[model samples]
Target: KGEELFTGVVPILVELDGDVNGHKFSVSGEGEGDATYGKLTLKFILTTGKLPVPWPTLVTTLVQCFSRYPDHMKQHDFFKSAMPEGYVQERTIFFKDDGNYKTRAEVKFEGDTLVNRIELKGIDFKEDGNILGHKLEYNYNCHNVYIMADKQKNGIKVNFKIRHNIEDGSVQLADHYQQNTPIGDGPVLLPDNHYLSTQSALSKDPNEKRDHMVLLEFVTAAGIT
Candidate 1:
């Protein structure tokens, strides 16, 4: 039998604006009570801008610069070097007078969420990465919910599989793969290096920050590499 990570009908969302030009969005499915089984957030910001450059072009440049990361390149057209044809390259760094800076974008989720509409907030275009974080949250009538594809209309189904940054107690979740697992299977290291191994590896990625989760153990294992 196939074990599903999140269960129930989900509220799906999409990005009408591409990630390249300073855009972000997310969706989530509720859990039991006020706490949801999973949640997700998406965000993109233009870090640097030039005086003579168009604001939209600056945003695109930032997105392209951030695309250098393997993680970013895997999804949207963030990398200017990787673009083709109608794609435009970074003319000048937006923030610096010398005209050479960088752009950054990041998406995250709590557990996992099936969102319908994305929410945007004020962004700071000074830094080089994750200038802002966006989140989408909604509630259902006390029922389990998960993401799914909408064949009726052109839409992207949202799902999350995430990992929390145990070091600063910060969680980094990306909106790639269209649909992803919020938490991976097997043993996971918690915020305190505590080892947590799920008995049933049937959960999403981008796991939530739990007070108690898992720790590492290089002790023994059956067979894995």
Candidate 2:
């Protein structure tokens, strides 16, 4: 047996449900969900020639931010971005501004959801066992989710990856932020023991609060030719 056809079909489901303002909203892949979800079925499909590299597969259940939305560069161009793409799921969510300082910085979950989407590109399993990809994402308002807790308004980064041998669903889960100013850089810590400006604080560079989900499964299969 010299070569074998490799195929993969990984299914992931994520669900987020809660109350906002005077109502409740939810977003879920479900795989279909309801708590007893998250039983992903992962399969492998391979591309051959010189090295057989499988395309990186991603699955989740959260309305995530778009590329560079939180980056130091186009950080403020929140209005200048594209909707992220992927498998679509039915979700219910509320949106509105955190309000103006005139209203005690008051924010009410009263409004409508415009539209959101994602497009995944340049994924690579180029390195054996290590998969890398850029997850472009975009979502509506996030302040409503954190302001109640008096926590920082949070946004999430989309550049994430996974190593085949590492723990599933536990990689980089804590990597979240909001304002993300390089100097007062929110939670991202640098090696410098001195320039700790806002490193020990919150509310800037990254909002520091948001909701998300991830579920994964692994499979080992072989076909002999």
Candidate 3:
């Protein structure tokens, strides 16, 4: 009733339930959407050993969230109870239908103890991939905004950032960047399959390469009742 910042229909809650690595996880956020194109921001809690164990570890390192198992974990053996309460892995992931996503998240020992947040800007997705010295093109067209002709050339690029604790310790920070090269150069709405398969080398070492991917489908299309 106050002012309309956006024009089209706006959805209140948009939630995505998925896993980072073999570790299961989920994200709840709010975003607006049209028929197929949309912008969503989501966040989930990650728990590990003592200090926050960042989320990227879900992919690059390997970690899981407690949401999958609460009581079973709460009454564990070696797991020490939380001193107080907090989430160190605090971050807001801004992902678009285009595959490009900028997310920052941190974590703590206790669940909800997220603190090692990393900031990522607009990064592109991958179009081609190379493995064992052989190159291949992943020419794709699927989810997003139904290939907007939209633009003659769609944007695409990628970046990665990692911060660690070396004062005689372990993992500390993990953040990444992605800009989707666009599916055949356009977005979609209600596409059966939306996906992102990515692989990149850490700035520190080219030998230490990491690969990750996610496939999404609109079981329930946004903006649809």
Candidate 4:
């Protein structure tokens, strides 16, 4: 059953075809809902682009799942292609005490059969010259269980790993991570709209500071259904 669920998983955005608030939505699922009959706070990593380009990028967006069954708003735009909601939560995720990190997502939903709770762990970009890579970890919650205080005591641990290749336009994943999942590209035109906007290279002049390698944030929420 686990193998079936895991292999069958697909990006939420590609699965759902509908319009909301005049905007289109994409649905991506790493795996299907568990058999426990409860909703889960799905975690994901979306990829916008790489370096040596324009500015602004969208990294990760946390979306709430099982809201419809839980009797809550089924769809809520945490972040969009035109507007990246995660950037404002924080500036960067490179330092301690949340100094260089950003808060991009938080979802809470109460359903009849299940209850959903999700949080944004932190998004960061890793790059090596024109070759770039991005990874987003949903640190807060990554499981589905009865909405009970004790449930918090027992956490179901599972992780989703994803990567994006901006130059080759190829996306892949590690052991659990999967590629081909739909994503929310950052702002139409602007810096910091997508993933890593202004890092060390994006500085004023190359001689002043050379940030040759660029890391972009992959869109997680936009991919989840």
Best by lDDT: 3
- Tens digits of per-residue lDDT for model 3, 41-101: 2222222222112223233221111111122222220101221121222223322221222
Candidate 4: TM-score? Answer: 0.22
Give Cα distance to truth, residue 119, candidate 2, Å.
1.1
Model 2 has an lDDT value of 0.20
Q: Distance (Å) between predicted and true CA of 21, model 4? A: 33
Clashes of 4: 34
What is the clash tally of candidate 1? 45
Off by over 4 Å in 1: 1-147, 164-225
TM-score between candidate 2 and the true structure: 0.19
Where does candidate 3 have its weakest 10-residue lDDT segment? Answer: 77-86
lDDT against the true structure, per candidate, is: 0.22, 0.20, 0.25, 0.22
Error of 2 at 184 (Å): 27
Residue 145's lDDT within candidate 4 is: 16
TM-score leaderboard ranking: 4, 3, 2, 1
TM-score per candidate: 0.18, 0.19, 0.21, 0.22
How much lDDT does candidate 4 score? 0.22
Which lDDT tens digits does candidate 1 get at residues 1-225?
A: 011212332222222222323444222222221102222222322222322222222212111111111221222211112211111211212221112223222222224432222222223343333322211111111111122333332222322232322224443332212321112232211111111111111122345532111111111111111
Tens-place lDDT per residue, model 4, 99-198, is 1213222221122121111222322323332212222221121212111111232211122322323335533222121111112333221211111111
Predicted structure with the largest TM-score when compared to the true one: 4
Off by over 4 Å in 2: 1-31, 41-53, 57-116, 123-151, 156-161, 164-225
**Candidates 2 and 4, the one with greater TM-score:** 4
TM-score of 1: 0.18
Query: How close to the true structure is residue 21 of candidate 2, measured as C-alpha lDDT?
Result: 25
